[PDB]
Amino acid sequence: LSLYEKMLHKGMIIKNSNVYEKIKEIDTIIFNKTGTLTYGTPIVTQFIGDSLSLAYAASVEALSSHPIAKAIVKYAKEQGVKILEVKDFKEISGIGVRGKISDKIIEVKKAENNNDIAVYINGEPIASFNISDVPRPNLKDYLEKLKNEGLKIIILSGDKEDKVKELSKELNIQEYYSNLSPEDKVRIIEKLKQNGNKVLMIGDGVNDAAALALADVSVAMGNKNVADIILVSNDIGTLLGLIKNR
Ligand SMILES: C[C@H](OP(=O)(O)OP(=O)(O)OP(=O)(O)OC[C@H]1O[C@@H](n2cnc3c(N)ncnc32)[C@H](O)[C@@H]1O)c1ccccc1[N+](=O)[O-]
């Protein structure tokens, strides 16, 4: 069994080659929050309103396939209400969903104040949803690496200050940057390599694609062609093993 076979057995595909000697140098670790430190999967964390309002909103969201709509529908079914028939349905990307039941106009869209999701009935907002991501069952062995070489650990996210801080508390590392953009991330990575730091970065979806390509060693989850490594196993722990045995 080659080095490619032994690494694959341990959940890791090595597309690169010299990546092994590169890792020895690494002094800083950066996570892109969504999809790496979480499953990247919205659920409803709270609903404010009554059951009739909840059934209307689910009925209209049942005709969409956007992951926000699927989460609302699934929450409503857990609460025991059922799906009702909708006329004149229209979906409007970037905004949300609209439709007609028992002679009332129902819209579901971003709230006028927050990132909350709001339910409008004949033009008045009568209910709302708080929607969050799902955290991977933690490895406090982050601390086992905070110990090891006392490496520097950083977290980048695009989500709002409320949401990215709470996670930064859930596990204990005191250095995160929230409210970011794909090109803001690239800027911070530059600004550190431009300080001679050797960076390993872990990423997943759309945003991180670009800063991964910018990393000394880059790692992409199992769910592009830029990553030195692929965690087909989606087991962050397995990687933490690789790091603390480098
Ligand atoms: C992917 C996900 O949500 P996201 O990343 O916000 O999806 P996005 O692509 O930015 O949405 P857009 O750009 O299509 O629509 C912009 C805004 O219009 C509203 N909006 C849009 N569609 C709808 C709808 N069907 N119903 C209600 N409101 C809607 C709504 O207020 C939406 O934010 C999610 C959520 C939580 C955790 C983790 C993940 N995750 O990444 O897996």
DSSP 184-231: HHHHHHHHHHTTT--EEEEE-STTTHHHHTTSSEEEEE----S-SEEE
- CA dist 223 and 108 (Å) reads 29
Q: Any bridge partners for residue 111, and if so which?
A: none
Q: CA distances (Å), 75 to each of 81, 116, 129, 208, in order? A: 10, 16, 10, 30
Residue 73 Cα to ligand 1 midpoint, Å, equals 14
For residue 234, the SS3 value is: coil
Q: Which residue has the tokens 């800027």?
A: 187
| Boundaries of every domain in the chain | 1-39+135-246, 40-134
| Residue 9 assigned ligand-binding role | no
Distances (CA, A) of 76 to 93, 109, 213: 22, 17, 41
Experimental technique behind these coordinates: X-ray
Distance separating alpha carbons of residues 92 and 232, to the nearest angstrom: 35
Give the side-chain half-sphere CA count within 13 A for 214. Answer: 21
Query: DSSP secondary structure string, 24-64?
Result: TT--EEEEEIIIIIB----EEEEEES-HHHHHHHHHHHTT-
Is 34 annotated in a binding site? The answer is yes
Q: Architecture of domain 1-39+135-246 in CATH?
A: 3-Layer(aba) Sandwich (3.40)
Tell me if 133 CB under 6 Å of ligand 1: yes
Distance CA 236, CA 59 (A): 38
The C-alpha angle with vertex 205 and arms to 202 and 210, in degrees rounded to 5, equals 70
Rounded to whole angstroms, the Cα distance separating 43 from 46 reads 9
CATH second-level architecture of 40-134?
3-Layer(aba) Sandwich (3.40)
Tokens standing for residue 220: 């992409």
PDB resolution in Å: 2.4
Q: How many CB atoms lie within 10 A of CB 98?
A: 18
Task: Tell me if domain 1-39+135-246 and domain 40-134 are identical in fold.
Answer: no
Ligand 1, atom 33: closest residue by C-alpha: 110
**Would you say 159 is a known binding-site residue?**
yes
